[PDB]
Tab-separated table of C-alpha atoms and ligand atoms in Angstrom:
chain	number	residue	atom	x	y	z
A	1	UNK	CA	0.000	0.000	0.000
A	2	UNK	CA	3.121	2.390	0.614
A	3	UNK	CA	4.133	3.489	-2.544
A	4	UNK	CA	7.804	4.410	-2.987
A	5	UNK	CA	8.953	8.143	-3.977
A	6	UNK	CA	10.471	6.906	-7.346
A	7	UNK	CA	7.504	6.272	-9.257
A	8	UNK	CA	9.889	4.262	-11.406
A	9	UNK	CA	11.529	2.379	-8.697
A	10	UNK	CA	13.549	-0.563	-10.665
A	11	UNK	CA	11.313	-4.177	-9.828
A	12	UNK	CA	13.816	-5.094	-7.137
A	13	UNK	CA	13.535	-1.837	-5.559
A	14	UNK	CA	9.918	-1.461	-5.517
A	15	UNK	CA	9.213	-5.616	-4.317
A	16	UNK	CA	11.618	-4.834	-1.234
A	17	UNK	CA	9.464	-2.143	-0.382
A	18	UNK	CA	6.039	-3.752	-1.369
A	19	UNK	CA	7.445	-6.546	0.588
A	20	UNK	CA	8.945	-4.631	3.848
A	21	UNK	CA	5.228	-3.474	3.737
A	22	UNK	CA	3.688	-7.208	4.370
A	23	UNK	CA	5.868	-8.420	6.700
A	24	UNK	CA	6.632	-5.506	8.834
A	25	UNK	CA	3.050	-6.269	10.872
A	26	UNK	CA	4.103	-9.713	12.225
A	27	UNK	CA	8.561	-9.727	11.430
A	28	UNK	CA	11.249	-7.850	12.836
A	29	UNK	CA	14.538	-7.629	10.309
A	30	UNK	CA	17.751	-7.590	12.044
A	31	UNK	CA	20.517	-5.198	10.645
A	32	UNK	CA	24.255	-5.180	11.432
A	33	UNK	CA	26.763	-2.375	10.304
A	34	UNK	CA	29.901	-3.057	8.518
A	35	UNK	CA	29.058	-6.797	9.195
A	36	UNK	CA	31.084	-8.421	6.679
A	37	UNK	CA	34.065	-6.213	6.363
A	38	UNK	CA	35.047	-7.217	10.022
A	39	UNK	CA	34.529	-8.151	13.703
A	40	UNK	CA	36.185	-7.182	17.050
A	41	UNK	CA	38.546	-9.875	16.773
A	42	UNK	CA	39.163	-10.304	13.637
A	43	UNK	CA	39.772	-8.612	9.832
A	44	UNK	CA	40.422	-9.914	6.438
A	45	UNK	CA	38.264	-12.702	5.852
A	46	UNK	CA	35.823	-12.069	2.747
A	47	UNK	CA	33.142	-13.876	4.358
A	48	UNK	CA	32.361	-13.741	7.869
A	49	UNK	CA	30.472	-11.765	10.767
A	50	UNK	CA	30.166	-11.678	14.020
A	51	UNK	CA	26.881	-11.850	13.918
A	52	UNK	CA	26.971	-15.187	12.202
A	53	UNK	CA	30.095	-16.650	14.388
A	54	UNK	CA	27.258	-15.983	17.221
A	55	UNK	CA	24.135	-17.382	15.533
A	56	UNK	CA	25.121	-19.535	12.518
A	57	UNK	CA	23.255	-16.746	10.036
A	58	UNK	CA	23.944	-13.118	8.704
A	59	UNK	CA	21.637	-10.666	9.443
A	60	UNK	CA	18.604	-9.572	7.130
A	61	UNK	CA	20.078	-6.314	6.599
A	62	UNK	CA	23.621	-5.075	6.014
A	63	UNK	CA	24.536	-1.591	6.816
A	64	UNK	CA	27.727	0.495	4.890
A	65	UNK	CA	29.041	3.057	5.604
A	66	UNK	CA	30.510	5.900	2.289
A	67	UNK	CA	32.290	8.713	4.273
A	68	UNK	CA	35.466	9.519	2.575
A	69	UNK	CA	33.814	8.495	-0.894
A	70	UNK	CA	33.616	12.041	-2.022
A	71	UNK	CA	37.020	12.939	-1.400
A	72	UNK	CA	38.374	10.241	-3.263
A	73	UNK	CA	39.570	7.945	-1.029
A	74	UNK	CA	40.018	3.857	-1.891
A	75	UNK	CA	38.757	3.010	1.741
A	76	UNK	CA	36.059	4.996	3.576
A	77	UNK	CA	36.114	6.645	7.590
A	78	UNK	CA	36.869	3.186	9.478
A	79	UNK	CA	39.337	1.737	6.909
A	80	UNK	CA	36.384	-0.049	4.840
A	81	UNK	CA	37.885	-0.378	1.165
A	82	UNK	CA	35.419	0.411	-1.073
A	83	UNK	CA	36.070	-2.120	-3.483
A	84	UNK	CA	35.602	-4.784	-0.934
A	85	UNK	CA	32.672	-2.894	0.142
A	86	UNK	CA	30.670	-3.418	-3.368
A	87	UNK	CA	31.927	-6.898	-3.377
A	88	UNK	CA	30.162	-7.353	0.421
A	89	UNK	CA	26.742	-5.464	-1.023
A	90	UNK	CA	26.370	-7.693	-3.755
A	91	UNK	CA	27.498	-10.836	-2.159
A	92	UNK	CA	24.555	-9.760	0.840
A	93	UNK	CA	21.947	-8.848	-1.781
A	94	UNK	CA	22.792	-12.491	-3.836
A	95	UNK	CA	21.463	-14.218	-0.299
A	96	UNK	CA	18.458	-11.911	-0.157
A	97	UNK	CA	19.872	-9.793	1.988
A	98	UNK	CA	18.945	-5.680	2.491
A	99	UNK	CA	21.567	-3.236	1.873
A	100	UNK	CA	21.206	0.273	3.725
A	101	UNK	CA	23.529	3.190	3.380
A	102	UNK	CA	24.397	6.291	5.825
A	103	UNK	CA	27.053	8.834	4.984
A	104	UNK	CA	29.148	10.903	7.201
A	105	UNK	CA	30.068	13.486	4.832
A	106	UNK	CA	33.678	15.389	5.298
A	107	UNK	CA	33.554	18.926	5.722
A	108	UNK	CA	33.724	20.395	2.507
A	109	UNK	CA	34.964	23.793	4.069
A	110	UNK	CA	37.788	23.070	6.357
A	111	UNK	CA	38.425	19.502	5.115
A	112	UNK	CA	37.626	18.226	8.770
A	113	UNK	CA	35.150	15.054	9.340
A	114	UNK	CA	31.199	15.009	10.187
A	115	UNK	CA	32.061	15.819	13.458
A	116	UNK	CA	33.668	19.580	12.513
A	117	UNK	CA	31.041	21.651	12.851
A	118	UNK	CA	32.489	24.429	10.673
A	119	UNK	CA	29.092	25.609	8.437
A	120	UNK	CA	29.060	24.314	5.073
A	121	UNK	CA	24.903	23.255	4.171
A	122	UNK	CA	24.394	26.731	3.447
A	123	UNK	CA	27.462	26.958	0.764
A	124	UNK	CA	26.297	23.796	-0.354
A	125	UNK	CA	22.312	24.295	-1.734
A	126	UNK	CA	21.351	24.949	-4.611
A	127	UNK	CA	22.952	29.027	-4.840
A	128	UNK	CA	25.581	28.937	-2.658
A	129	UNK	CA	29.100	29.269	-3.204
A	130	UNK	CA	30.332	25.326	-3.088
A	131	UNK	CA	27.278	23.845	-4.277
A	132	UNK	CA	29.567	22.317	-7.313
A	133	UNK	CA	30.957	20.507	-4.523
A	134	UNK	CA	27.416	18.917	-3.501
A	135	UNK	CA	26.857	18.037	-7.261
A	136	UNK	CA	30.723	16.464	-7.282
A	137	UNK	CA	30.060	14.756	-3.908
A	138	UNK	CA	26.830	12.704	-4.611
A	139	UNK	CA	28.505	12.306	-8.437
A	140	UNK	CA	30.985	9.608	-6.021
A	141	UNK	CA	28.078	8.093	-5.197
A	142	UNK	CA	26.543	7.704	-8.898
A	143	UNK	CA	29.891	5.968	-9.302
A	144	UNK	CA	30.026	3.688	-6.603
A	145	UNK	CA	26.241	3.221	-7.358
A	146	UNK	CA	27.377	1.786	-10.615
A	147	UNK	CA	29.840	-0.767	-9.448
A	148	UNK	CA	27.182	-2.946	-7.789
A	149	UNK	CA	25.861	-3.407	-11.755
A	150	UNK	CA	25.322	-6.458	-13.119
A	151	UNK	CA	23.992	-7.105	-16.758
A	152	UNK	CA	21.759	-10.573	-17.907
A	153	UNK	CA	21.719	-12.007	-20.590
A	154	UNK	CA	19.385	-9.644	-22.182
A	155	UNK	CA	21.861	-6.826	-21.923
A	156	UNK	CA	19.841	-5.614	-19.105
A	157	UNK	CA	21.406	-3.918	-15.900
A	158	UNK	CA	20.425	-4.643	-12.593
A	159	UNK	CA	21.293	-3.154	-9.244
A	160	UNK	CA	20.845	-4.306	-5.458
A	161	UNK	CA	18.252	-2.000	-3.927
A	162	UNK	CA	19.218	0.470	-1.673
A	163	UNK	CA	17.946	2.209	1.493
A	164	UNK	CA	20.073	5.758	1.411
A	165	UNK	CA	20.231	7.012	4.508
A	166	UNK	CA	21.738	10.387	4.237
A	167	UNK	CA	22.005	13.386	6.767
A	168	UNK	CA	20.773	11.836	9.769
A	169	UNK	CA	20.630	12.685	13.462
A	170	UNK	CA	20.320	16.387	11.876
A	171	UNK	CA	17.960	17.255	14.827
A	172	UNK	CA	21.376	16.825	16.838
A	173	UNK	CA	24.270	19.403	17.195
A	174	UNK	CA	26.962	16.798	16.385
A	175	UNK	CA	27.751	17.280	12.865
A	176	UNK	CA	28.254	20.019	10.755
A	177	UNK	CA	24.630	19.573	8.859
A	178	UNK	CA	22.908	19.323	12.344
A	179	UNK	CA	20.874	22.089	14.606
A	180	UNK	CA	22.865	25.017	15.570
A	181	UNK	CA	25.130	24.927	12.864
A	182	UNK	CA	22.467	25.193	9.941
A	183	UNK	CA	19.009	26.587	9.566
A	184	UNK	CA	16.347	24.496	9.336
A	185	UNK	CA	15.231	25.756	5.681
A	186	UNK	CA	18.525	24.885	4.782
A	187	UNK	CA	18.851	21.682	5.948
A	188	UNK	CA	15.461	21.550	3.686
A	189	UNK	CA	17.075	22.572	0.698
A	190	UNK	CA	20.174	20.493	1.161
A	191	UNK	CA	17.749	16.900	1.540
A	192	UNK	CA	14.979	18.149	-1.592
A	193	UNK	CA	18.602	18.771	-3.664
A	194	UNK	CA	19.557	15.326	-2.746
A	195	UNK	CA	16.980	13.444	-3.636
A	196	UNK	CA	15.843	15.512	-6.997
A	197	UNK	CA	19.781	15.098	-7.851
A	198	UNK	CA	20.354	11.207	-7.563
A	199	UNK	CA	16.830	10.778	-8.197
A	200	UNK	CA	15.678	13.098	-10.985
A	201	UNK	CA	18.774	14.060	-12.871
A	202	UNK	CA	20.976	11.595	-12.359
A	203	UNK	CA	18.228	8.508	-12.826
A	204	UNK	CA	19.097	6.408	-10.355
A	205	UNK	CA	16.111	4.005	-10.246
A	206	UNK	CA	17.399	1.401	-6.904
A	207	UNK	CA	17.499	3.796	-3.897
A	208	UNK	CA	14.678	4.375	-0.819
A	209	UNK	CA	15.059	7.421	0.943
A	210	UNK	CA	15.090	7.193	4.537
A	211	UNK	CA	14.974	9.845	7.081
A	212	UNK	CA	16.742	9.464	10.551
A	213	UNK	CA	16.650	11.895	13.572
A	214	UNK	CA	17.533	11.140	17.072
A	215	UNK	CA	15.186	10.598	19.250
A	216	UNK	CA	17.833	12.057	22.470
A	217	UNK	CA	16.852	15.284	20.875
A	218	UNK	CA	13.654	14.826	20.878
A	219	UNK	CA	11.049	16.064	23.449
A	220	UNK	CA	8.965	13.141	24.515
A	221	UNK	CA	6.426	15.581	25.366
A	222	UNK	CA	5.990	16.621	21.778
A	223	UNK	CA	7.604	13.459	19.844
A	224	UNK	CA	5.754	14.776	16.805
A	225	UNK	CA	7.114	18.037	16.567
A	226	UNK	CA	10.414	17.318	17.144
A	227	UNK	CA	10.465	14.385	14.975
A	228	UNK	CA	9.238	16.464	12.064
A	229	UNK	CA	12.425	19.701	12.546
A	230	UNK	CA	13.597	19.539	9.159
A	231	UNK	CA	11.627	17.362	7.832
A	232	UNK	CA	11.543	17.755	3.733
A	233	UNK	CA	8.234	16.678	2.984
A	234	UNK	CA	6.557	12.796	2.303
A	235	UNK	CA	7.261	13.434	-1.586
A	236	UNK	CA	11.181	13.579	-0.404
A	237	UNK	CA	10.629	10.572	2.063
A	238	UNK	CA	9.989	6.517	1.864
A	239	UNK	CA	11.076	5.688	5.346
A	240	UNK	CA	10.848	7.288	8.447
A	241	UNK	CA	13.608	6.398	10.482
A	242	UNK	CA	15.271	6.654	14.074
A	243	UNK	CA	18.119	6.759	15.553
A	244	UNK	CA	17.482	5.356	19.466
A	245	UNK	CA	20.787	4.436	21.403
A	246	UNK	CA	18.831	6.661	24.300
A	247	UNK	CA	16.642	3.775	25.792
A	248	UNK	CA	18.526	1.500	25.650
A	249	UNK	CA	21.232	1.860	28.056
A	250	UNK	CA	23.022	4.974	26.537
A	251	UNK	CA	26.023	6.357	29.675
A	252	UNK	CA	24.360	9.432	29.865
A	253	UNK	CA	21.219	8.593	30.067
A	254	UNK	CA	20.158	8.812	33.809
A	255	UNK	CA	16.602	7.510	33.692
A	256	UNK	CA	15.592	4.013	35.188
A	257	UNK	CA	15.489	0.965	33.191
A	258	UNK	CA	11.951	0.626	33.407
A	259	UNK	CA	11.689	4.325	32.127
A	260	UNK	CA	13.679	3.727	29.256
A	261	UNK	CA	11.587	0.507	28.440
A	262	UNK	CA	8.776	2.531	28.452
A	263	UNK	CA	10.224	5.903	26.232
A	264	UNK	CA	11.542	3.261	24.211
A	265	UNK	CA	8.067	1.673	22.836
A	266	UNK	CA	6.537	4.876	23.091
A	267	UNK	CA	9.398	6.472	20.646
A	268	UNK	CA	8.523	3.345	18.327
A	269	UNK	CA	4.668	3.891	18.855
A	270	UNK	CA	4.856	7.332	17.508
A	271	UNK	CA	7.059	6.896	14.782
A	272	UNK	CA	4.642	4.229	13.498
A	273	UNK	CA	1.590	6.920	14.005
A	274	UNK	CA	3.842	9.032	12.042
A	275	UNK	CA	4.266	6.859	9.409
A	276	UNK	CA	0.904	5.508	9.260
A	277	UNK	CA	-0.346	8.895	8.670
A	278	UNK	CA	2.309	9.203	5.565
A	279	UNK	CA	1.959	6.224	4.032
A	280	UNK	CA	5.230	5.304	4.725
A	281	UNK	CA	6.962	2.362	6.461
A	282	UNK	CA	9.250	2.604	10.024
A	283	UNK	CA	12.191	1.731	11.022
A	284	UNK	CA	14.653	1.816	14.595
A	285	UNK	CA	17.472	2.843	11.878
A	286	UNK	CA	20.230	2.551	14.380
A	287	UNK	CA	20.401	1.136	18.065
A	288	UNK	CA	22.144	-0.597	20.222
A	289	UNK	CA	24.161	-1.116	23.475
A	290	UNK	CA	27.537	-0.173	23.054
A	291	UNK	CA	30.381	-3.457	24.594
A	292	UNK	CA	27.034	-4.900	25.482
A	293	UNK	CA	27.349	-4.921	29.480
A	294	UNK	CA	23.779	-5.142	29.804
A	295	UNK	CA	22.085	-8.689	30.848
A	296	UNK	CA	19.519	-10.075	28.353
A	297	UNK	CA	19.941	-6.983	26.502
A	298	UNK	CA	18.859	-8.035	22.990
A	299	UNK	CA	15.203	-9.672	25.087
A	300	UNK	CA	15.049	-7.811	27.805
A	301	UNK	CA	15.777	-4.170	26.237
A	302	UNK	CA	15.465	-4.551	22.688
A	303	UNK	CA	12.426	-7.267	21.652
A	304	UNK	CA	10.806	-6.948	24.633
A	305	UNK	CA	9.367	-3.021	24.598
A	306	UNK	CA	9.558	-3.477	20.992
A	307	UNK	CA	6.712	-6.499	20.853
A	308	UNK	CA	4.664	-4.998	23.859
A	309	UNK	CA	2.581	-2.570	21.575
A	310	UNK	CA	1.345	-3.480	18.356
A	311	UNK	CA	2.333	0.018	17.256
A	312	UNK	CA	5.651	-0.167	18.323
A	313	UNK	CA	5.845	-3.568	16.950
A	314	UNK	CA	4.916	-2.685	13.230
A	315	UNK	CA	8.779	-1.214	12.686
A	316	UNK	CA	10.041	-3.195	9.644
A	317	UNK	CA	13.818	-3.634	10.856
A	318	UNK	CA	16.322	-2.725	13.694
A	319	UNK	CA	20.076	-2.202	12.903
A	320	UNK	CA	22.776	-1.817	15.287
A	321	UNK	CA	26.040	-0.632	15.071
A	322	UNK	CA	29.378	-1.754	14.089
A	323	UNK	CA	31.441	-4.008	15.877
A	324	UNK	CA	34.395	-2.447	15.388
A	325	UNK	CA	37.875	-4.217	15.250
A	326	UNK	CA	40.007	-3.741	18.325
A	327	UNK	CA	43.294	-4.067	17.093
A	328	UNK	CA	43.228	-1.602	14.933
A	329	UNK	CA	41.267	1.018	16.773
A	330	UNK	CA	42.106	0.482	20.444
A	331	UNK	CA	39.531	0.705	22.006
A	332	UNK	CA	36.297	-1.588	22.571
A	333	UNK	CA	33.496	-0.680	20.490
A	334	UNK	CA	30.926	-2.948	18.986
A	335	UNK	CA	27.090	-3.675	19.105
A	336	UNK	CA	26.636	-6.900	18.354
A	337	UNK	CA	27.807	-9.731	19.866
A	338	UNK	CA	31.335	-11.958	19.000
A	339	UNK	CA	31.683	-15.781	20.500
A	340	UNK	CA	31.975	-15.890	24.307
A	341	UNK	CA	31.010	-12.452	25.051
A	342	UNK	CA	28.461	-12.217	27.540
A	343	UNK	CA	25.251	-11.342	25.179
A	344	UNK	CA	25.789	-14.178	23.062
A	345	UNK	CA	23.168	-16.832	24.459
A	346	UNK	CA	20.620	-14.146	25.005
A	347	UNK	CA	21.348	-13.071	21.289
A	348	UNK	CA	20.736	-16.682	20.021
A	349	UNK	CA	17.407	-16.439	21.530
A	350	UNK	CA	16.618	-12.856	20.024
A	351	UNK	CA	17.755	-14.881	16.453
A	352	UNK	CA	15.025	-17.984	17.566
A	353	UNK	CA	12.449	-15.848	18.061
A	354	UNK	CA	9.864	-16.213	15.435
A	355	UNK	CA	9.349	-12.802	15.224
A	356	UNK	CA	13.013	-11.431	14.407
A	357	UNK	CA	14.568	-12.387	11.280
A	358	UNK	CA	17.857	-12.881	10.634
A	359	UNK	CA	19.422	-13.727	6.087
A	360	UNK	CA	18.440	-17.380	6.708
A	361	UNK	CA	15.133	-16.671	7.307
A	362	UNK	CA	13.860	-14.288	4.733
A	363	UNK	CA	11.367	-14.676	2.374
A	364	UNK	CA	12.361	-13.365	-0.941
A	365	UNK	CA	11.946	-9.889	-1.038
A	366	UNK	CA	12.425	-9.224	-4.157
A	367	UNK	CA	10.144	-10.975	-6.160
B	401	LIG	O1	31.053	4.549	11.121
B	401	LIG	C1	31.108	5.942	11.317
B	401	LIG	C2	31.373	6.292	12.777
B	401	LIG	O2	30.381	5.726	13.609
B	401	LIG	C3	30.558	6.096	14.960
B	401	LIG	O3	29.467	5.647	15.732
B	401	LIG	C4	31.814	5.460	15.499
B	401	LIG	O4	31.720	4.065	15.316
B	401	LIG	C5	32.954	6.057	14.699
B	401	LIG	O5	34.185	5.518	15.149
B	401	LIG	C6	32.751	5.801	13.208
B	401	LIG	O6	33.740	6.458	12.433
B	402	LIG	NA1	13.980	-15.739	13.843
């Protein structure tokens, strides 16, 4: 019943969506970022995860990562070679898998990462100074785009679908295209640009738009409200997203378990209203509890709020973070678990349950 933004969605692209639709009422798809390209403990292998170490299976849906694309570079923010990267896409996408992309653009202006908060949206819309840049940017990404190609038999090219997830958290103050460091109308501008770019001049026929703010920034009080701060419009928009590390465990977060149990359904609750009213589909974009110190998280804090409203429940996937590799960047960071670490049963059983579903379980999903 949701009906994509591209009105001329390639078949792949518009049967994942058609398909997210169905099963989003009684399934739950698990996502994992940077699964494939490596684990806490390990890098180099061209085919493993963590996630499957833990459980025996990959999960539904594989989140990349392109920062560093648009400035050239063979490998992206984290070390992820791009090359490998489109070899990991399509090898997900031949088992069925999703594929979902964010992008923590470089500042243009001072040559600093997402985190440098020098302005640069307003140089970068359509008018301003550097907006040659924007065009030359998401060009990187037509590239890339086209190196996860193939062509049958009838000379016919295909592509893995994509859900582009681009500017997110922007209700935040973190990164340079976030609150306080751009206006709101320009933050607009910068998203319609975006998507009438990759979508309307460049043709690009295999991507679903998906919008992600943060729900720490958001006033519980007025969920709608602050959900909807920047938003571009539902003809700019096929999935509204969230980013929710909040209630589930996050340090600073100083409210009681049960509290957060309870902000955390009624963020998902609300987000589904919100999308039922678009005629759009909802997702928990990114989550997770970071080292995983929390018992039973993935049941307890995770599954658990999520199935206790049917609302809540009708997300269509949940992806966590990376897990990412310790050797190389000293310190412990990762979201799902790795063999032996203390989530790993309780992880099993968010895998069994009937409800979540993990590559091995999918249904095809794209027709
Ligand atoms: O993947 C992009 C970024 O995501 C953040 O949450 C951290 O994991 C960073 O170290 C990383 O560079
Ligand atoms: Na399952």
């Amino acid at each position: 019943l949701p009906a994509l933004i591209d009105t001329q969605a390639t078949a792949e692209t518009r049967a994942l969506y058609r398909n997210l639709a169905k099963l989003r009422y009684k399934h739950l798809l698990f996502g994992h970022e940077d699964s494939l390209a490596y684990g806490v403990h390990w890098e180099g292998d061209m085919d493993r995860s963590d996630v499957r170490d833990v459980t025996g299976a990959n999960p539904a849906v594989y989140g990349w990562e392109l920062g560093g694309l648009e400035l050239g570079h063979t490998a992206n923010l984290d070390a992820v070679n791009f090359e490998k990267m489109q070899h990991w896409i399509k090898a997900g996408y031949s088992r069925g898998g999703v594929i979902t992309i964010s992008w923590h653009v470089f500042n243009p202006v001072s040559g600093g990462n997402s985190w440098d908060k020098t302005p640069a949206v307003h140089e970068l819309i359509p008018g301003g100074a550097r907006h040659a840049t924007l065009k030359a940017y998401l060009d990187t990404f037509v590239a890339f785009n086209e190196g996860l190609a193939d062509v049958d038999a009838q000379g016919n090219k295909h592509y893995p679908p994509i859900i582009f997830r681009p500017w997110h958290e922007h209700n935040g103050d973190w990164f340079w295209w976030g609150k306080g460091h751009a206006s709101e109308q320009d933050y607009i501008a910068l998203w319609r640009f975006t998507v009438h770019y990759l979508r309307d001049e460049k043709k690009l026929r295999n991507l679903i738009y998906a919008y992600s703010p943060d729900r720490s920034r958001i006033d519980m009080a007025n969920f709608e409200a602050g959900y909807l701060y920047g938003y571009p419009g539902d003809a700019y928009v096929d999935i509204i997203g969230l980013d929710n590390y909040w209630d589930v465990g996050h340090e600073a977060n100083t409210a009681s378990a049960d509290e957060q149990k309870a902000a955390l359904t009624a963020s998902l609750k609300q987000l589904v209203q919100i999308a039922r009213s678009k005629g759009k589909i909802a997702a928990l974009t990114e989550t997770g509890n970071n080292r995983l110190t929390i018992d039973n998280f993935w049941t307890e804090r995770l599954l658990g709020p999520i199935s206790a409203d049917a609302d809540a429940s009708e997300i269509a996937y949940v992806m966590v973070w990376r897990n990412a590799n310790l050797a190389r960047e000293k310190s412990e960071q990762f979201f799902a678990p790795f063999p032996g670490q203390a989530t790993a049963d309780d992880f099993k059983r968010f895998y069994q349950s009937e409800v979540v579903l993990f590559e091995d379980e999918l249904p095809p999903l794209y027709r």
